Design a protein around this ligand. Structure first.
Ligand code: BCL
Ligand code: BCL
Ligand code: BCL
Ligand code: BCL
Ligand SMILES: CC[C@H]1c2cc3[nH]c4c(c3C)C(=O)[C@H](C(=O)OC)c4c3nc(cc4[nH]c(cc(n2)[C@@H]1C)c(C(C)=O)c4C)[C@@H](C)[C@@H]3CCC(=O)OC/C=C(\C)CCC[C@H](C)CCC[C@H](C)CCCC(C)C
Ligand SMILES: CC[C@H]1c2cc3[nH]c4c(c3C)C(=O)[C@H](C(=O)OC)c4c3nc(cc4[nH]c(cc(n2)[C@@H]1C)c(C(C)=O)c4C)[C@@H](C)[C@@H]3CCC(=O)OC/C=C(\C)CCC[C@H](C)CCC[C@H](C)CCCC(C)C
Ligand SMILES: CC(C)=CCC/C(C)=C/CC/C(C)=C/CC/C(C)=C/CC/C(C)=C/CC/C(C)=C/CC/C(C)=C/CC/C(C)=C/CC1=C(C)C(=O)c2ccccc2C1=O
Ligand SMILES: COC(C)(C)C/C=C/C(C)=C/C=C/C(C)=C/C=C/C(C)=C/C=C/C=C(C)/C=C/C=C(C)/C=C/C=C(C)/C=C/CC(C)(C)OC
Ligand SMILES: COC(C)(C)C/C=C/C(C)=C/C=C/C(C)=C/C=C/C(C)=C/C=C/C=C(C)/C=C/C=C(C)/C=C/C=C(C)/C=C/CC(C)(C)OC
Ligand SMILES: COC(C)(C)C/C=C/C(C)=C/C=C/C(C)=C/C=C/C(C)=C/C=C/C=C(C)/C=C/C=C(C)/C=C/C=C(C)/C=C/CC(C)(C)OC
Ligand SMILES: COC(C)(C)C/C=C/C(C)=C/C=C/C(C)=C/C=C/C(C)=C/C=C\C=C(C)\C=C\C=C(C)\C=C\C=C(C)\C=C\CC(C)(C)OC
Ligand SMILES: [Ca+2]
Ligand SMILES: [Ca+2]
Ligand SMILES: [Ca+2]
Ligand SMILES: [Ca+2]
Ligand SMILES: [Ca+2]
Ligand SMILES: [Ca+2]
Ligand SMILES: [Fe+3]
Lengths: 59, 40, 280, 258, 319, 59, 40, 57, 40, 48, 40, 60, 40, 51
């Protein structure tokens, strides 16, 4: 609602200003998430399948 | 300050509106969160 | 490249022990006769050390050998080889690095000087830096010598070098009572107070209250002339500073040069000469 | 911590926190660092570092508005600046090569003795009168009870040989500290402000040696417009000169020793 | 061979400047300012006068009270026999309440005076931060001391109200004597792992260093270019000059990047604040959070690993 | 009813400082809250389902 | 600020929708992520 | 692409272009690491780690 | 900025297109992995 | 895309890859010579 | 400062042909290593 | 050879003074580095087996 | 820079003969090593 | 020799005083750095064989 009126914001906030400042979040938040998640839930990297190629493959 | 009435009044609404969009967005979350992993 | 106004200071020469050769810049750094050398050691260290990171404890294979700053550390040789080049693997390498790092701070130190000259300024900077330089020698040289052991110095571990202190520190139980360590500590504190004042005040006068003029000393010299009553002065602060710090260092320097080669009992004891005074 | 992900708890979260806001505030400074002197001038070399951004990673901050004291214009930063002159020739065209001070360097106004053009308005005290003044108007002052009065001390070139003497020692209403000494030179029979900072006291022989410029150079010393007070513009002006002496007064100095 | 601004060679003097007058509310300044040639051979030789408002007195009073407690109880110790009080000085002190009354008001004896005296070095300390922000802006001055003061005053509370009282222990709160206090830090390191492993300390260190570093540089730098009014930063902040010209340039052709006669003073105020900040951090985590930071560390893959030329046995297991 | 009256609050608050200010506070609380929620509220990520599957499949 | 309601309206729109592109892009991720290995 | 050329008016081509040139390597060097690290190492974890530790002796 | 929509789109062409040159060469990368040493 | 050197002076990115190579060459040989294989003593000759 | 297709192109030619030059040194490098000692 | 054709043009960019010595630096740093790294693990030719392994003869 | 096309040619040659110089010197000693004692 | 014939022109880019004294200091240490590294393990002639 008021999505029509919400356009005026640019008249108070620089586009470039809130522009790159978001482009950041994705990086800052992006690596941060994957990082936060790996240890906490489903450590997809070394946890489950496939079984170690190091020991299973060599040995 | 650094504004007048017709702007304060007008903007006032625009912002205000959006504020609630959140009260909803956040509510669907607190409600859905409770829906899934309730609490208290 | 150059600063908005740097373009007008880059005179020719001013070098120390020669350097009118490489007397030029690169990026925003002046080279000269020292920017050159220091570099050498830098890689023949920053990377020579990498070899170490590679090698590790047992060998580059040992599960012990890792690549996590938190753990990676080059260990000095055993007290065995006293004042002699140890096998890189067993110690030397450590020495080697340390060998370099010495100059890398002796160059950059001097290089500072050539600069201090070019920019026709005062030299308080390097002279200061030297102390800091020295405290690194009398804590991996002046001491280990009066201990006949190079490997008797400390490591190069991101945090590993921490324990090295933990021990040598407890080697006297309550290291805390070391007369020096007390003062030397006190300074590294006082400094971190005055500093937390000057750098504050200023940033509170040049950028004062809303709709207010860039205040003048006529305030500063009273700001504390009110709270604390007296004001060391403005010129002064930039004195007390160097003082504190350039002392704190030199102090601590003593602090661990005497701990050992000049005192073997637990410090707490040293504090006895006090008690035993034929008075109380 | 270097490998990837291992342990998992609470406090270890926070260590991330601060050690994040740090890398934020770090930039804040970066910007605040850039105010003046920015942007850079030439292309003698590019920005050394990890990410060679156009001009500094932190987008130059905005203009800051410095509300000067009473009866004072207003300063801002950043604030575009008008290019200056370069009274010198590059010893070499190579980026990063030095620039030789054409003609007489002692005044060629370059590097060792260069300087900016600060406002030509004597910096005043709290209410109005100008801070740095000679002991003339600074009549309400008095030498530190004890310290040997410098008024009458004969200055002496770094060459040793005399080079005029002194007069009024420009004190200050802000802080009872001597900042300048009037030096009625010998050849010019004029007045050349002596920057205490460059003046070494020798209370033993009434002398005041200045290992900065030969006795003669006291003649080429930028002359003061008015003797009863000095403006910021010149406050930097007199100084910068002697400064050069540090790398000019002798062929020796400037050139390397070994 | 140039006068290296060490001790103001020749000095000079003018009447007692009782600072810029203050608005409607700031009581009269007080004191008949004095001069000391010696003190002055380093800085502004004038002495005073000083302000004293409400918190001014109110705070000072709440000050020389704890002292008159932590001071008294201490003397009592060596049975009011000063001679030894003088001897066992650096040893003496006043300990907190016994682990029993964890938070309860300790009896007039067992660690009581300490909780008493403590709270009076809890307010007066907090009240003096008021004797700043107050006398601070009433000078038309912004607030950056008042700020930091907190950061510091923060850590102080992380060594009391906020943590000692946070673990229910009128003990977990530092003693009250040079040595004993010198011991508390010692004791602490132990009781919980070994601080060298709690990042927020190994962190708060780098800062206590930086400050020990920077305010140590810029102190010189300024001096180096103090001839060119560097010391006058004030204006240099506004109207630049050869000072900030020669200076920053230095660091430019040294460590590369550089800044402004302004900026620096920033990092200054920062490193500093960002010190006691990290201080009270670890000290807050260490206690109600991780109990052994050494374990924490390694458990996170932090703590290093060396060979083993020595190891022991374990009675609790074989016996 | 106070709704009609409330508009004038803008007359004292600069748009920039409080408009994005709240943008700053909202962002901080979400990071905090999602962060306090795990400790006692529920480590939804690795608490119950699904978890521990990786170890059963790793080898 | 420093721009009339025109250019603003112009940017606002083109942008607004695009910001939806992600809400959509990332939603196909969370979505497909729930598919391989759900959680909660 | 059709209309997205407009964005090149808010972001400098050299700044955004080089800025990203640097971003990938850091995000790049950071990847093979985070993957190589604990994850299924490939360099010498198994084979041909045959000569690595065996060939030696 | 510092250019009109004429050379703003021309660059956008080269930029955008080549930008895919990676999204593709980077997909062949991962895909080449999904076939050699898989994951999950 | 050859028209790309219009936004970058040669020197700026010409050397930004001259060193970047070296800041990888040493790194590469070092991480490889590290864990992968130690061509030095990892096969021949056998430890003295 | 300044750049024009005329002078711009010239350089690209010499540069690009030097780029593969190294790349060819990298294919011969690893490939040859694939023969001496395998990896993975 | 192959890249020889237009490598004379590079010299406007790369200054002789700026990059002539810079290389001399890397080389010297590399030199020690290589001898150093080789000596640490591979064949510590210095004191391993030849020619006369004397240090062992006298010490023992 | 600090030269023109001519001088650029003049140096590129003289030095080029010097660079290889080292190089050749290199191989003879890098080879002599390979021959005398093999690494691998 | 090989490079000897026209190498003479390099002296217009390498001032003598600076390249001469420079090499002196770098070489001297370069030697100690060697004996040092060599004297470490190879053969510590001092204590190794006789007398
Ligand atoms: C804690 C227990 C539950 C849970 C309960 C909740 C609850 C309850 C809520 C969320 C909410 C959110 N959760 Mg959660 N959440 C859980 C697990 C997760 C996990 C996870 C990996 O497990 C993730 C990644 C998230 C992530 C998220 C965010 C998407 C979302 C908003 C956070 C916020 O405060 O922003 C901070 C806010 C702001 C900065 C301001 C608002 C921004 C708006 C969109 C823009 C305004 C217009 C502007 C002026 C225009 C210019 C654009 C730019 C600003 C320049 N949750 C668990 C399972 N979560 C909230 C939500 O969904 O809101 C929709 C919410 O209320
Ligand atoms: C065992 C634990 C003991 C203890 C054991 C020790 C031991 C053991 C030692 C100290 C030392 C010191 N301790 Mg103690 N200490 C304890 C508790 C404390 C506490 C405390 C609050 O509890 C404090 C405040 C201190 C304070 C101090 C300092 C006074 C002192 C010097 C530090 C220093 O800055 O050297 C200054 C050092 C330098 C300037 C050198 C490094 C800089 C070089 C020149 C440049 C590096 C460049 C780099 C390589 C290049 C790459 C670029 C990067 C960007 C950097 N200790 C406990 C009780 N302490 C040390 C000391 O006294 O040294 C003299 C010492 O050896
Ligand atoms: C981990 C699982 C796999 C694996 C999976 C992958 C995957 C999946 C990918 C790689 C990719 C790469 N891998 Mg791999 N890789 C493995 C093991 C290795 C090993 C090893 C020793 O074992 C090594 C050394 C490498 C090395 C490499 C790099 C060659 C390459 C790019 C990385 C990057 O982030 O660039 C970041 C980029 C940049 C810094 C530059 C920007 C690129 C642009 C588009 C070009 C420049 C344009 C410019 C403006 C024009 C002017 C020209 C000049 C720049 C002046 N891999 C294992 C076996 N690898 C990536 C790749 O090869 O892409 C082709 C990739 O997508
Ligand atoms: C790891 C398994 C193998 C192995 C596999 C490989 C592989 C695979 C490769 C190398 C490559 C190299 N290896 Mg190896 N290597 C091994 C063991 C070794 C040992 C050893 C003691 O055991 C050594 C000393 C080396 C040393 C070397 C370098 C000679 C070489 C380049 C590295 C590099 O990236 O530089 C980084 C960067 C540079 C040198 C700069 C780029 C050069 C450009 C093209 C010229 C600049 C032009 C300029 C504009 C003009 C100015 C002219 C002058 C500068 C004035 N390897 C083992 C046996 N090695 C690389 C190679 O040989 O490439 C041909 C390579 O691809
Ligand atoms: C009281 C004096 C304080 C001080 C002052 C000080 N430091 C200074 C200066 C001054 C005045 C400079 O002028 C100089 C500077 O920044 O100049 C621009 C500097 C400096 N202070 C520095 C560091 C530093 N200072 C410290 C402390 C202090 N410096 C004191 C608090 C500390 C610590 C631990 O407390 C550190 C780490 C540098 C950033 C810089 C000097 C840089 C320099 O000369 O670097 C030369 C070498 C290289 C860049 C490459 C390194 C290659 C080597 C071969 C490896 C060395 C390995 C090392 C020995 C092991 C480290 C591992 C540890 C984790 C165990
Ligand atoms: C990183 C932050 C650093 C820091 C910052 C900091 N400190 C600060 C501030 C700031 C920003 C202030 O604003 C404040 C200050 O000085 O304000 C003017 C202060 C301060 N830091 C102080 C001390 C201090 N700071 C320390 C450390 C630090 N402070 C950190 C390093 C340390 C340590 C442990 O190293 C100390 C000891 C004080 C000087 C001052 C706060 C003073 C205060 O709150 O006083 C309250 C009032 C009293 C104590 C009453 C005094 C009673 C009488 C006036 C004296 C009579 C004599 C006395 C009782 C002796 C006994 C004699 C008997 C016989 C009677
Ligand atoms: C896998 C992998 C990535 C491997 C790595 C492989 C690599 C990279 C190998 C290369 C290794 C090499 C060669 C590394 C060296 C590179 C170089 C040259 C790095 C730079 C070295 C260096 C000393 C950097 C600075 C260190 C820092 C940041 C120290 C911090 C201390 C600190 C807070 C300093 C403050 C700095 C500032 C702001 C100075 C400015 C400043 C000051 C201090 C004033 O006092 C002053 C007074 C009056 C007016 C103005 C000023 C003023 O501007
Ligand atoms: C013509 O143009 C005009 C002039 C009209 C200007 C145009 C303007 C426009 C277009 C404006 C647009 C405005 C918009 C889009 C505004 C959006 C606003 C939003 C998203 C506002 C959000 C507000 C959020 C608020 C107020 C949140 C309040 C939160 C509170 C009070 C939280 C309290 C939290 C506590 C106490 C937390 C404690 C932490 C725990 C629980 C951990 O303690 C235990
Ligand atoms: C008259 O005209 C004049 C003469 C003035 C101008 C003339 C100019 C001339 C003649 C110019 C000549 C230029 C030349 C000869 C240029 C040569 C250029 C070369 C050889 C360029 C080589 C470029 C190489 C590039 C761009 C390499 C890119 C490499 C990348 C992106 C590598 C990424 C590597 C990664 C991510 C590695 C990761 C390692 C692991 C996986 C271990 O990290 C975890
Ligand atoms: C007015 O004046 C008039 C005109 C009358 C002229 C009068 C002039 C006069 C009176 C001039 C007098 C001149 C004098 C007395 C000159 C004296 C000159 C001396 C004593 C020169 C000595 C230069 C000594 C040299 C060149 C030493 C070189 C040493 C070397 C190369 C040492 C190498 C050491 C190594 C490699 C050590 C390695 C140690 C280990 C093996 C441990 O490293 C691993
Ligand atoms: C007999 O004495 C005469 C008359 C001769 C005068 C001489 C006095 C002298 C010489 C006094 C000397 C005193 C000295 C040397 C004191 C030294 C003190 C030191 C070294 C202290 C070091 C650290 C102190 C700390 C960290 C204190 C922390 C205190 C805290 C955190 C207090 C907190 C209090 C709170 C939170 C109170 C809350 C109120 C209640 C308890 C009701 O909340 C439940
Ligand atoms: Ca998985
Ligand atoms: Ca509940
Ligand atoms: Ca106790
Ligand atoms: Ca769950
Ligand atoms: Ca493998
Ligand atoms: Ca091998
Ligand atoms: Fe300052």
């Amino acid at each position: 609602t008021m999505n029509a009126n919400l356009y005026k914001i640019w008249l108070i906030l620089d586009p470039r200003r809130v522009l790159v400042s978001i482009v950041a979040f994705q990086i800052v938040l992006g690596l941060l998430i994957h990082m936060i998640v790996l240890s906490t839930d489903l450590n997809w990297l070394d946890d489950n399948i496939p079984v170690s190629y190091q020991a299973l493959g060599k040995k | 300050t650094g504004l007048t009435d017709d702007e304060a009044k007008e903007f006032h609404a625009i912002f205000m509106q959006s504020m609630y969009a959140w009260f909803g967005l956040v509510v669907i979350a607190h409600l859905l969160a409770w829906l899934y992993r309730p609490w208290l | 490249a150059m600063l908005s106004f740097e373009k007008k200071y880059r005179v020719r020469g001013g070098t120390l022990i020669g350097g009118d050769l490489f007397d030029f810049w690169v990026g925003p750094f002046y080279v000269g006769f020292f920017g050159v050398v220091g570099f050498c050691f830098t890689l023949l260290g920053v990377l020579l050390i990498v070899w170490g990171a590679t090698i590790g404890p047992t060998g580059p294979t040992s599960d012990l050998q890792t690549y996590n700053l938190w753990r990676i550390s080059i260990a000095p040789p055993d007290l065995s080889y006293g004042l002699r080049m140890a096998p890189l693997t067993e110690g030397g390498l450590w020495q080697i690095i340390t060998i370099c790092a010495a100059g890398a701070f002796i160059s950059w130190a001097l290089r500072e000087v050539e600069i201090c000259r070019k920019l026709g300024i005062g030299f308080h900077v390097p002279f200061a830096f030297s102390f800091a330089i020295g405290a690194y020698l009398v804590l991996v040289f002046v001491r280990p010598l009066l201990m006949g052991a190079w490997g008797h110095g400390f490591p190069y571990g991101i945090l590993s070098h921490l324990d090295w202190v933990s021990n040598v520190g407890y080697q006297f139980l309550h290291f805390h009572y070391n007369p020096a360590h007390m003062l030397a500590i006190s300074f590294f504190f006082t400094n971190c107070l005055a500093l937390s004042m000057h750098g504050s005040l200023i940033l509170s006068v040049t950028n004062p209250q809303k709709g207010e003029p860039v205040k003048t000393s006529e305030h500063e010299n009273t700001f504390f002339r009110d709270i604390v009553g007296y004001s060391i002065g403005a010129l002064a602060i930039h004195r007390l500073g160097l003082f504190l710090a350039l002392s704190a260092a030199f102090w601590s320097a003593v602090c661990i040069l005497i701990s050992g080669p000049f005192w073997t009992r637990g410090w707490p004891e040293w504090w006895n000469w006090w008690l035993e005074l034929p008075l109380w | 911590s270097a490998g990837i992900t291992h342990y998992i708890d609470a406090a270890q979260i926070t260590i991330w926190a601060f050690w994040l806001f740090f890398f934020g505030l770090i930039i804040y400074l970066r910007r605040e660092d850039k105010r003046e002197g920015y942007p850079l001038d030439s292309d003698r070399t590019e920005r050394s570092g990890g990410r060679v951004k156009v001009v500094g990673f932190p987008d130059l901050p905005d203009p800051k508005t410095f509300v000067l004291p009473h009866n004072g214009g207003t300063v801002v930063a950043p604030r575009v600046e008008a290019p200056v002159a370069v009274n010198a020739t590059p010893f070499s065209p190579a980026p990063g090569s030095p620039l030789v001070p054409n003609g007489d360097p002692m005044l060629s106004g370059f590097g060792p003795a260069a300087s900016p053009d600060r406002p030509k308005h004597c910096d005043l005290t709290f209410e109005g009168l100008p801070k740095i003044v000679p002991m003339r108007v600074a009549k309400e002052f008095s030498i530190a009870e004890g310290d040997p009065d410098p008024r009458g001390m004969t200055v002496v070139g770094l060459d040793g040989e005399v080079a005029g003497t002194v007069s009024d020692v420009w004190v200050d209403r802000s802080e009872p500290q001597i900042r300048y000494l009037e030096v009625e030179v010998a050849a010019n029979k004029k007045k050349v402000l002596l920057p205490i900072g460059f003046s070494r006291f020798d209370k033993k022989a009434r002398k005041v040696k200045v290992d900065a410029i030969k006795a003669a150079h006291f003649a080429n010393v930028p002359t003061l417009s008015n003797p009863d007070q000095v403006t910021l513009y010149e406050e930097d002006k007199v100084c910068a000169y002697y400064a050069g002496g540090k790398l000019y007064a002798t062929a020796e100095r400037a050139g390397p020793l070994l | 061979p140039e006068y290296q601004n060490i001790f103001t060679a020749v000095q000079v003097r003018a009447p007692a400047y009782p600072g810029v007058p203050l608005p409607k509310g700031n009581l009269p300044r007080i004191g008949r300012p004095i001069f000391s040639y010696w003190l002055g051979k380093i800085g502004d030789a004038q002495i005073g006068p000083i302000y004293l408002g409400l918190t001014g007195t109110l705070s000072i009073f709440f000050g020389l009270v704890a002292i008159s407690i932590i001071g008294f109880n201490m003397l009592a110790s060596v049975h009011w026999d000063v001679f030894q009080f003088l001897k066992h000085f650096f040893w003496l002190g006043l300990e907190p309440p016994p682990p029993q009354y964890g938070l309860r008001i300790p009896p007039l004896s067992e660690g009581g005076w300490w909780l008493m005296a403590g709270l009076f070095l809890t307010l007066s300390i907090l009240l003096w931060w008021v004797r700043t922000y107050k006398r601070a802006e009433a000078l038309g001055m912004s607030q950056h001391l008042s700020w930091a003061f907190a950061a510091a005053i923060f850590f102080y509370l992380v060594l009391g109200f906020i943590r000692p009282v946070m673990m229910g222990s009128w003990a977990k709160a530092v003693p009250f004597g040079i040595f004993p206090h010198l011991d508390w830090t010692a004791a602490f390191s132990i009781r919980y792992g070994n601080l060298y492993y709690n990042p927020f300390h190994m962190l708060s260190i780098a800062f206590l260093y930086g400050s020990a570093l920077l305010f140590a540089m810029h102190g010189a730098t300024i001096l180096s270019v103090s001839r060119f009014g560097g010391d006058r930063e004030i204006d240099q902040i506004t109207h630049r000059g050869t000072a900030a010209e020669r200076a920053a340039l230095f660091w430019r052709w040294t460590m590369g990047f550089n800044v402004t006669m302004e900026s620096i003073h920033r990092w200054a105020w920062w490193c500093a604040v960002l010190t006691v900040i990290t201080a009270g951090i670890g000290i807050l985590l260490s206690g109600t959070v991780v109990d052994n930071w050494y374990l924490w560390a390694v458990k996170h893959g932090m703590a290093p690993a060396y060979p083993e030329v020595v190891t022991a046995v374990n009675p609790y297991e074989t016996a």
